[PDB]
Amino acid sequence: TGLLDGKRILVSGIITDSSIAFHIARVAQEQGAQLVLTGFDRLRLIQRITDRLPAKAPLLELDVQNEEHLASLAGRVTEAIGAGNKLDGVVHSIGFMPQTGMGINPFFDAPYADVSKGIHISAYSYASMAKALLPIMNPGGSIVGMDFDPSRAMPAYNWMTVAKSALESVNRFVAREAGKYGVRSNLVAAGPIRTLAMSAIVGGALGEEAGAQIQLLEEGWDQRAPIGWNMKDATPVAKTVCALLSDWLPATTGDIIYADGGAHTQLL
Amino acid sequence: TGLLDGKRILVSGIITDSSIAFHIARVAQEQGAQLVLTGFDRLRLIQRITDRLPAKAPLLELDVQNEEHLASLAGRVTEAIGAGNKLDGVVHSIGFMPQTGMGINPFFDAPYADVSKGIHISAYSYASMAKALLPIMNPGGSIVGMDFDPSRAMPAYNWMTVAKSALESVNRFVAREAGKYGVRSNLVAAGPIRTLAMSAIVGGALGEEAGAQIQLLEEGWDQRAPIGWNMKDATPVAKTVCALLSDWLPATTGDIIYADGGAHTQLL
């Protein structure tokens, strides 16, 4: 039996088939969920990527900086899943930070206009998605967002670290609001996964130094993780997200589940 | 159907049918697990309690202060589940602290002999159970222990708070050892549940309930929890434990999952 049988779940943040969102969606479908997908900017490309999922699913446009998309989202979703039906799950797998706020680019030289855009998309949007979608969410439902442990500073993650620290704070306030609908809000702090963003945005910002990033990642995660960590395998992260969409973590909200091989609990 | 289909799991710490362990066991069985149970001291009584579980399960004696029980445990378990079979899960739901280290008894008046006994049973035993049982645990398996958030001091929990702080530290070292077997070790920080032990904390069971205690708990948990907290319902805690015994939190180890209605993420 599907862990998510007859749950209607919204999954944002697919762009390639390496995306964490893609694998969340794949696993969710294997576990009996009906999906609704959202995508940003490259809709024909995303469409061709989502056809590779095990089952057909509607795809809607959502740019989280666009007030009109947010205002119309609930309605467009209602249309896709049929009137008098609702979502049981929502997955926020979205992030962005301009090259100026990342990599070897000095921390101090990122102008606030750039930092602000990143916080808008990576942090604020968790609240605006919640605002838009809670009115069409069943009791017992689950909102989930993706996090990267920002509790200690680190090389290269720079201003995205600050956005994630903001996200953790937003998640806790969303939990309060979501509570009134009988809905949980949580984050998954994933270990590093080889995705588009990782390689092109993050590694891109190191240009010449890009080997250095792999040193940090090997050091901070697989070496520290008591059960190891594999950057080429999003499945453990995807399953962790599905666990939170399920009924099997019913007492957990405003919280962060670490899907990092346990790396964050070990110093060396 | 079963979240735990054909998993062989050991559950310690049943004494009444209010015990967290009893409900862990109940839910695990509903989810297709074959169980082995352990009990302390009152074996005939525990036996009569465990017959009330949905399915028959073998019951072994385990006093975690007794080196001979620990040395023989693996063997006795192997006998119960059949040679060439192994455990996929182990649940530590055990605790004790002498009256001197809890309730209105002044913190400074608890002699070390008493505190030591409590730390032995409540914290050290997590490691000694792990030591005894990992040699008969399959890769992919999960050890789980019960925690009560000791990160801030509080009235009455006194020296048990210290034992729990110790337990959290032990759990992280057990994760390292368990890692070598492909096994996860985690704690569930549960909210308050009306159990035998809980009533023994202030003034011994059989007393009227103890108003100050009940108020503190409602204050610290249901009021703070965005989704509420019900002390008479162990199901949400039991499900959280089963999620960690399952394959759906495969990347999480050395860690603490909060099953507390989200109370620990809200200040008031």
Added chain:
Amino acid sequence: TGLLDGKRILVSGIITDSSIAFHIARVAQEQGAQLVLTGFDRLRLIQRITDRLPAKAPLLELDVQNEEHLASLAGRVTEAIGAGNKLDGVVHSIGFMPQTGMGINPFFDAPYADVSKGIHISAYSYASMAKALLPIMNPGGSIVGMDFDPSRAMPAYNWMTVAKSALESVNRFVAREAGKYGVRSNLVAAGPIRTLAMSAIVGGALGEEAGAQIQLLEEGWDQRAPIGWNMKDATPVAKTVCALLSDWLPATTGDIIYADGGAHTQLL
């Protein structure tokens, strides 16, 4: 002898004589420091307030959203303290959040334009001040910022909680940069102090619920604090800040010192 004898220190964020910054400055002067002050918007008013300090000190205009002020700040400071002299200390005591992001105003109804302004002033500005002033800071020097524990969500603080979570993350990255100059960067997480911002901005946002605020504060701080907490006394906060400006916490950086009566260490 002055704890801060012959230290040249910059203190931002004075607006009334209740301001935390005013008391930081007062205590610093009592302890032998030469000060340079910065103020926002109401310069004639601030000037009349700073004349009430024990000693004369130059006052400069600094609006942290204004790139020209930031670009010229180092120069204007150098002029005030004399060429070939430098700062040993910098105090960031600055914050802002539009009423939409605070109080009874629904969390989800604060538009990002408003939240962004608050994060700019309350969080980003810590970095931009550091960027501007480190080039004129002696080795052994100390940057300090003011924090309000955002690790758990709470009523009313709303989007300022998010700004503070961001600030904590920024402080850790500023520490890295400051390190290369032999300079420490830390935050003081203060308990509640009756200041202009507290009463007019925060209490203002509750309008008709403003009694609620005083109750929550007494509940979260004085009741929990083992040594008590007095909202009408900024001295303990000011002294804590001076300790970090001094040579007596030389091994502490990227960190948070709690000046809250110990409230954050007790559950209730």
Added chain:
Amino acid sequence: TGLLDGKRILVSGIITDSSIAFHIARVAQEQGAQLVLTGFDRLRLIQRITDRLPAKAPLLELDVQNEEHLASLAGRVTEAIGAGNKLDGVVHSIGFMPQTGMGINPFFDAPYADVSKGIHISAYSYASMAKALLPIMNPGGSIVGMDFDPSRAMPAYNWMTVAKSALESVNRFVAREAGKYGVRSNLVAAGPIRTLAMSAIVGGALGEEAGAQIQLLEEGWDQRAPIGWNMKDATPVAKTVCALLSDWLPATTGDIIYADGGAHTQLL
């Protein structure tokens, strides 16, 4: 001049002139404090070491496992400082763990008798010292203990990590008791310092693995620390402790100050 002028302070835990306690005591005396010292086992040796302090100070025997010493301590101290006088400060710089609970010795092979002794000395004793001495402590006074960040597991520290996790929990409860006397209780989480215990107890437990591990530590605490870290220099730790004994952190209790160069705030 003195940060600690006319404060009467008790300093435990001197055994060599590399001991953290020795440097705490030295700095405290330079800052105008009258000291009372305590020592374990090797009294003639400790006596010859304490004569190297800048000023004469009485030396008392205290083995924290000995109930008779604890019962008589307050009286013996009163005798040393003169009747009708009291302590303003108490410093716990004490620790022990048998070789079985440390280094390359397997975590699971440390028998509880050994772990218990270490927790007794390293954790419980903080409370028993407090119990014995609070009755002779002035309002405004400060108790301080030494910590090593146990919040993440690590190689070699093993069961001492568990003792430190216990200590942090005890410190929070001692704060509550100390509060009733107007007294603060806090810990200093120090970075690594080359002391007798470090080299003989900890390094001893690595035997063959020893030299490499000391070099790694000096490299990594220092590499992570934005202001660096020098294991041969206890002054920064000693000053941090004096700051807590002083009047300049009056709002901090039940808490942990990190004197680690900021290493704990940086991931790499």
